[PDB]
């Protein structure tokens, strides 16, 4: 409108909001059509469940491959988003019980779950590069902001996703039988809307093409790095002052440069797994805190299940508040953020959050008696402090690491940085799983746990944030 | 594994309450549900609970309000019918199902392998 920031984004912030309120709307509903229309064991719902999940963690790395080599992105983005139509017209399919039984559905409800899990895979870290594009290199302060609007899209998405899903799945009957296929045929419009407003906005894009196959160069330019050292029997230079510089008999210094910054932000997000992980393990245990405590808060009663809510709601003001309140005073004294320090800071908010639910989880257990009531019975408050300093963690953290991928990468790889910290949550999420089976320690211990690895991870990543080199 | 059933008459609008105890392996690795065969009909799905309770299912006439509960200590089952009419007055078998990944409806008897004696509840 006034300057500095594009028209475009318009249809790149609805977009995404689009994407994640459908994306919401069918993952809730997804266990409860394994459970009650396909009548599937619990431990097989499960595992689908979680399948599907992992995969929609871990395709991001092709999307973004396909997005980079070739193609360039525009053109992913608009294919992944058919493919992910298609999948949502196949799960929507599936659910109506009229054609085929029992082998349809399983076989349309799979397809489609793998075509949903693609689209998502290839729509996330393309969407954010292609948005971050549309900005000047020199307006570096208005990207920022809108990574800011983009987060708040996100959250926005799944905040009306949580209050609109249950309204659809209620009291509804398809065919004589409760209403799956609308459940599934919602986030298929919604998907639908998405995409034809993102491509509404075409003529005013700044499409970027692709920088040649630049995935197959930066890994033959690294197997070339590492085989040169192998002069077992000889050597005079393999490679010094750096693993990269004696590359250099081909591979140009154009592409080592931009493999050499590649390899020193995957360097930096090596931690940082451990940190989704750490950080995954409060919408689980802090519900059974909650059980523990009264919630009938005088004026509503609050179920412990609601409470995961109070999550989105404060991103959406955190966002907002941190942006253009606690940053500015921040910068009114010499005082500066350098966008790891604010990562760093978020790491040591997240380990004060666990810290102050072990401390609240000790108190509960401090009871003592005076339809008898326990007079030392903590209301569902006392579970802000660590819901504000959890949620302030989320938004440093999370915000930031969206602007530091994309700035601190080449202009050739702008969506492979951001498939790199997509794979951290991949990852961090694959460690959730593998841990949560081992479980056998105190609420209040465990807390005392995960506060203490936390800042473990704080310092391992402060100490390798200290020596990393940005790009220049 | 080796489940067995108790139960007994009942009258035309009263309630009943069954049994279904697993006297081998841990009841906790099972998967549970309740069938009925009327006489001279085939046998019918009525609910079914999986390991821990979790989920549970009840077929589409639940004739009343059904209520199946399982405690894994002491491995006992139990089955709450209601308002029960002088129909379903079937012979009510336990089925026992060992936990794995299938893709077989869990409200099916192939989907059991432990089919113990069942009851004769009368109306
Ligand atoms: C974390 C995180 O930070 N930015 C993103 C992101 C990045 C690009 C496009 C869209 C998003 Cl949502 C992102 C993300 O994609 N995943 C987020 C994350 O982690 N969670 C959200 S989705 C989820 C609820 C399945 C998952 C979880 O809680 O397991």
């Avoid at chain 1, 931690?271 to 805190?289: E, I, K, V, Y």
């Avoid at chain 1, 997509?422 to 105190?442: H, M, P, Y």
Wanted: aromatic fraction near 14%; glycine fraction near 8%.
């Amino acid at each position: 409108f006034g300057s500095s920031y594009p028209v475009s984004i318009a249809f790149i912030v609805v977009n995404e909001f689009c994407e994640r309120f459908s994306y919401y709307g069918m993952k809730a509903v997804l266990t409860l059509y394994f459970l009650y229309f396909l009548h599937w064991n619990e431990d097989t719902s499960t595992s689908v469940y979680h399948a599907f999940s992992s995969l929609c963690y871990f395709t991001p790395i092709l999307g973004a491959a396909i997005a980079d080599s070739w193609l360039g992105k525009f053109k992913t983005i608009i294919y992944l988003s058919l493919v992910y139509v298609l999948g949502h017209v196949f799960k929507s399919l599936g659910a109506i019980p009229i054609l085929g039984g029992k082998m349809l559905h399983t076989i349309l409800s799979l397809v489609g779950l793998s075509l949903i899990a693609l689209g998502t895979g290839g729509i996330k870290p393309c969407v954010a590069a292609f948005g971050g594009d549309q900005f000047e290199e020199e307006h570096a302060e208005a990207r920022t902001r809108y990574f800011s609007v983009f987060y708040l899209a996100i959250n926005a998405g799944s905040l009306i996703s949580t209050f609109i899903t249950p309204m659809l799945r209620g009291d509804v009957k398809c065919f004589g039988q409760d209403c799956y296929a609308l459940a599934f045929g919602v986030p298929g419009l919604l998907m639908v809307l998405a995409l034809v407003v993102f491509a509404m906005g075409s003529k005013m894009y700044r499409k970027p093409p692709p920088e040649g196959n630049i995935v197959a160069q930066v890994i033959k330019c690294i197997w070339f790095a590492l085989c040169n050292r192998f002069r077992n029997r000889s050597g005079d230079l393999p490679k010094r002052q750096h693993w990269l510089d004696w590359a250099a008999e081909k591979y140009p210094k154009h592409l080592i440069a931009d493999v050499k910054a590649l390899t020193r932000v995957l360097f930096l997000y090596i931690p940082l797994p451990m940190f989704w992980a750490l950080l995954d393990q409060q919408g689980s245990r802090w519900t059974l805190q909650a059980n523990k405590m009264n919630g009938d808060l005088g004026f509503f009663v609050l179920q412990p299940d609601q409470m995961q809510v109070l999550n989105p709601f404060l991103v959406l003001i955190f966002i907002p508040l941190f942006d253009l309140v606690i940053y500015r005073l921040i910068s009114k004294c010499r005082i500066n953020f350098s966008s790891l320090r604010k990562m760093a800071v978020g790491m040591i908010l997240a380990c004060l959050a666990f810290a102050v639910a072990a401390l609240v989880e000790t108190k509960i257990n401090g009871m003592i008696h005076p339809e008898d009531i326990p007079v030392n019975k903590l209301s569902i408050a006392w579970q802000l402090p660590q819901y504000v300093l959890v949620t302030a963690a989320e938004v440093m953290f999370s915000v930031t690491g969206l602007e530091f991928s994309y700035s601190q990468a080449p202009s050739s790889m702008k969506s492979v940085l951001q498939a790199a910290w997509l794979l951290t949550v991949a990852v961090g999420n694959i460690i959730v799983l593998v841990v949560a089976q081992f479980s056998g320690l105190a609420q209040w211990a465990e807390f005392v746990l995960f506060s203490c690895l936390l800042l473990v991870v704080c310092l391992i990543f402060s100490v390798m944030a200290y020596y990393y080199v940005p790009l220049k | 594994q080796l489940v067995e059933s108790g139960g007994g008459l009942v009258q035309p609008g009263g309630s009943l309450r069954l049994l279904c105890v697993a006297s081998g392996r841990p009841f906790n690795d099972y998967d549970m549900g309740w069938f009925r065969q009327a006489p001279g009909k085939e046998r019918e799905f009525v609910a079914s609970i999986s390991w821990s309770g979790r989920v549970t299912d009840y077929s589409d006439s639940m004739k009343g309000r059904c209520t199946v509960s399982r405690d894994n200590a002491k491995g006992t089952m139990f089955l709450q019918m209601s308002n029960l009419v002088p129909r379903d007055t079937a012979v009510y078998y336990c089925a026992a199902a060992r936990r794995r990944w299938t893709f077989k409806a869990t409200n099916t008897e192939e989907f059991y392998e432990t089919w113990g004696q069942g009851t004769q509840v009368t109306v």
